[PDB]
């Protein structure tokens, strides 16, 4: 199910979002992170940026580079 495990806190300034059809990441304004709930199925095909708007496209920072910028245990899921 798309209500994937764990959660953070707040909306704050500009954020990331995960694809619920794979697991790839995209940088978004906080106006989208306030619209997307845990139940909201955000995916690559819906992505704002047509350069990255597929499960087959790339991302702004690889999962082991982004999770280090936040300083967190993301991608450890393997799923």
């Amino acid at each position: 199910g798309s209500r994937r495990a764990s959660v953070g806190s707040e909306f704050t300034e500009s954020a990331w979002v995960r694809c619920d059809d794979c697991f790839k990441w995209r940088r978004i304004p906080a106006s989208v992170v306030g619209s997307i709930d845990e139940s909201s199925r955000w995916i690559c095909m819906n992505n704002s940026d047509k350069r990255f708007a597929d499960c087959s496209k790339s991302q702004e920072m690889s999962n082991e580079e982004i999770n280090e910028e936040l300083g967190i245990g993301q991608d450890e899921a393997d799923a």
Binding site: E13, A15, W16, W42, E69
Partner: peptide, 9 residues
């Protein structure tokens, strides 16, 4: 959609 937000201004 499990995610987070960067501590980088």
């Amino acid at each position: 959609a499990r995610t987070k937000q960067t501590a980088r201004y």
